[PDB]
Automatic annotation (TrEMBL), chain B:
Name the record gives this protein: CRISPR system Cms endoribonuclease Csm3
Source organism of the structure: Thermococcus onnurineus (strain NA1)
TM ranges: none
Family annotation (InterPro entries): CRISPR-assoc_RAMP_Csm3, CRISPR_Csm3_endoribonuclease, RAMP_III_fam
Domain of life: Archaea
TrEMBL record, chain C:
Source lineage: Archaea, Methanobacteriati, Methanobacteriota, Thermococci, Thermococcales
Family: Belongs to the CRISPR-associated Csm5 family.
Disulphide bonds in the chain: 127-260
CRISPR type III-associated protein domain location: 5-244
Pfam families reported for this sequence: RAMPs
PANTHER family linked: CRISPR SYSTEM CMS PROTEIN CSM5
Record-level Gene Ontology MF annotations: RNA binding
Keyword RNA-binding: yes
Annotated protein name in UniProt: CRISPR system Cms protein Csm5
Biological role: This subunit might be involved in maturation of a crRNA intermediate to its mature form.
Organism of this sequence: Thermococcus onnurineus (strain NA1)
InterPro entries noted in UniProt: CRISPR-assoc_Csm5, RAMP_III_fam
GO biological process, one term: defense response to virus
Automatic annotation (TrEMBL), chain D:
Transmembrane segments: none
Membership in a protein family: Belongs to the CRISPR-associated Csm2 family.
Keyword RNA-binding among record annotations: yes
GO BP annotations, alphabetical order: defense response to virus
Origin: domain of life: Archaea
Molecular function GO labels: RNA binding
Keywords carried by this UniProt record: Antiviral defense, RNA-binding
Pfam families recorded: Csm2_III-A
This protein's name: CRISPR system Cms protein Csm2
Species the sequence originates in: Thermococcus onnurineus (strain NA1)
Function (record text): This subunit may be involved in monitoring complementarity of crRNA and target RNA.
Amino acid sequence: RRFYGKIVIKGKIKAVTGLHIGSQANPVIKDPHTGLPYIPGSSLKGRLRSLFEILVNSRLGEWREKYPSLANYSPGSCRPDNQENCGKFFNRKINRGWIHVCPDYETALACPVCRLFGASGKESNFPSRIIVRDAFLTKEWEEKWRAGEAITEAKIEVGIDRVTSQANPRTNERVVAGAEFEFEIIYNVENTTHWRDDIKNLLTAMALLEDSYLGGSGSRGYGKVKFIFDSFEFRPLDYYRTGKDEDIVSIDAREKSVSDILSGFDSLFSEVEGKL
Amino acid sequence: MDRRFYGKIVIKGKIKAVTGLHIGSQANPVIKDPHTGLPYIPGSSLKGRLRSLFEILVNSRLGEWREKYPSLANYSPGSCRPDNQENCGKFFNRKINRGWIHVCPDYETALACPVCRLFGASGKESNFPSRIIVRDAFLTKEWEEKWRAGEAITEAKIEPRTNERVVAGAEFEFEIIYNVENTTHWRDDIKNLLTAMALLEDSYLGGSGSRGYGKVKFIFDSFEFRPLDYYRTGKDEDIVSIDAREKSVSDILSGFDSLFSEVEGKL
Amino acid sequence: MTERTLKVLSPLHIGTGNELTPVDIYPRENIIHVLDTERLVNDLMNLGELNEILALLKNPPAYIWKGYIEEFHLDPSDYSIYTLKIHGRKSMQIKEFIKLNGRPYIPGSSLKGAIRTAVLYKALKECDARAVMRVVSKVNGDVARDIGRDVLDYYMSFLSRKRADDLLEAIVFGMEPDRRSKIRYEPKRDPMKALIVRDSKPVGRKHLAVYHVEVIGNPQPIPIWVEAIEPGAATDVEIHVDTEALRLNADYFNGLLWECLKERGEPGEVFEDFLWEAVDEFYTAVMKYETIEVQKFSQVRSFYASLEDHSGHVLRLGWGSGWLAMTIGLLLVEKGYKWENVRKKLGLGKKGSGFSREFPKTRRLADGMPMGWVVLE
Amino acid sequence: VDASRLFGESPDVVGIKKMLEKGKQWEAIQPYFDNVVREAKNFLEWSPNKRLANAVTVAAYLTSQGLKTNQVRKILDMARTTELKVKRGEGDIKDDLVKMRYLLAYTVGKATGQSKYSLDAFHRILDPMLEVLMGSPKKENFEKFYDFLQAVVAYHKFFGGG
RNA sequence: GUGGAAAGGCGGGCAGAGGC
RNA sequence: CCUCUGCCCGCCUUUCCAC
Ligand SMILES: [Zn+2]
Ligand SMILES: [Zn+2]
């Protein structure tokens, strides 16, 4: 479907405070062979999609011209009226929770949200344009697990009656703070008009996650994840056709998500703008 | 129904352990980072004692605030230890195992509770998410260097038993983030938050405390607003309300809306 | 009130369970010095070994093991206290004071445990006709406290590490539901969980000195070396009662102390006023009791007659406060034979039993001053 | 029972707990290992479970004696801070090993009275190994003591100490 | 011309109460 | 170093298939 190229973003997710992404004495999820923790791709994609739908919901007025089909929603959840595709923004009842998923391919081509994360509706659906891989540990932290150090902790938290001061403690496992991860996000350039927007929106939602939390408790301190990029390479359609290493590389080993979202958006991606 | 976003008021600063500081775990060790072996105040343990003191503040004032914050027509000041109901006319209406806590049972009751809109509610069916997030606060940079060079960061205090305590004078870094989800009531939620911190400077933090293990004292460095425009553009164009030599008993004091005139300028 | 400052009227030793071995000390003058072994040992390497690890473990004839640094080196000390007495032939173990950064402070757990003894004394004075109605609720053992007849006259025969005060703290502070015994303590039921005392500001190096505590009561007196805050040092401490924590617990407190507060008025309002009237009635009563015994040293009585006409609240702390000042047993003097069989039951003298001087024989006073007096106001 | 049930590796780890909770039987059976450990001046001369087997005999040689914990901890809570600086922090802990041997010399010079042969049981066995850390790295040849560090601590609680 | 497309294991919870 | 506490409450699949 008009495939042009794939933009790959590789960076290190870093846990400044102890990450906890559970399973159901409260385990963080683990590889069933190595036993080392990991961050899923369902759990990182959907935390970016979540924080960004709350972002668009506040801006259903300013964005009606840059994004068409955003004038059909009024900001809110369609939870009060148990009908899907009413006039609100959060309009698909998945099971009990209401999520913005656009109803139709020709509207989801014009939403800022459903164009990047995709949508499902009768009479076809829009496949996502990103692939959020699972974020395993880096090899420096395998080789601290090989070295015999800890890699998860067991934290004990208590709830307290405020009048009697009676304590009833519970324990959460969480990954040790400091653990470096390794992510990869593979955008799919299906249109060449909106590829800058979908990358600026993917970096907007990554900047929300650096002041929100990823996974677990977070309001009590479990998030505080930090994104550290390495390199963004755009793979052209001809590169696959031949397998010759002939692809643009935007190199930024030490940059934030706010130092790359607008500081270098046109200064680093200028060579990606050229080749389309 | 209708969760929005406008920005994130970020309160940074530095906690001063004026007296020795003991937040234990399981010869009675204070929790430390497993990686660096150094103590810290958890955000779980700081958000609780900020909520322990504020609910008791609201517990004594349930009559004269039900016109400013409605849905306090549900509550009469008390508890539910006398009779096992999860929800009656009493303020402490959460079983929470053997000790009761105040949690409104729904989104829209907690949307007008001044407590559960700030620290966050929980409920069967609909539930309300928290608006402050409290990171775990570690040691500062200059007390790393005192650990690098052999200055004591801990001490054993024989009480016949030993309560270990983080040695007094030590400082920790604490970051508090408030989520502006509705522009009409952000002023109260910043005032109700600093109200909860003024109570902590008179109460204690962790451990016994009635034997003097508390006297925690905040030292502010920066308020920052961070509007929605900041997330879209990486430029540092956000409001920086410096209060660097101010005290929590002076920011919330008259001197508040002089500090918070520039948050108005974005709305 | 907040920041209720104190002063110090006698030597005051808050122990930390640590002594200074003579390898830590070398007194060049009448002043003494605390050498830094970690820095001095690592500073005496440049001139060179395994000899330091052999000699310090050997502990030969102390003097030469600290004066051997004088050869081609000098001046490695930490705190440099003063001796303030006619002693120190090293042969001593200076007990050290509790310090947070090498700086002496008063711990708040030690000033609360002195108020708790004063408050426990006031509760057993006023509360046997009312002490049964406290244990009438969910205890069922007040009939034994009624048939004996003022729960003290039963507790002398009830007993007839050490958990001797287990029932008496469970009657005056915290009635539990049930146990394998009759009743037990519940920390959740206590008015003293509303009493907040905090660690004081640090005192200072200038007010700290070594002392020479002589034990009197035997024909051969023994000396103990110790360091203590000199009399005349004044620091500031803040004590307050959180009245909001009493209003929430008006139905949950079950003890004789709570039945001393409902008779002075509102029980969540007079607890701070009851608190100091308990202080100046335990500690003035132990102040007058020590004017009976004259076995000390003369000048000791001239200290006790001068403790009067002194404004503020007078109380004991520390290490030299004897068995009379740490214990209910000031009130257990008037029993006599009801406590005489029990004091041998508990035991006392060792190396059988002390007959006529069972409890009060030892007096630990520093330089002719009865040590451990701190006056709040 | 004297040098009959007790053998090299794991014969009497479970049966000697009742005998230590005796006087003349442990005064001669445990004296041979406390001399062989003195003859074990090379610390990493045991890659098998010989250390953990000798840890029971040394803790039985420390069972009938005192071994107060407040003198134990500071020597061994300094042994962790050396290890905490191994984790990409430092590579030369030469200046602290002189202070490490000084704390054991300060310990045997302070505990006077009925605790002489207790702390001299402590002073006997470790000084063959406390010379080894000076001319040796940390990534090997220290960590094997750090296992035998707590090996003697734990069984000493198991035979009835503390 | 892919047993596919869309789908945050999370919301709330002071390791504390007395113990010199 | 002693005395009570040592996980609760939920959703547990929803929706799309052009005769
Ligand atoms: Zn959409
Ligand atoms: Zn509420």
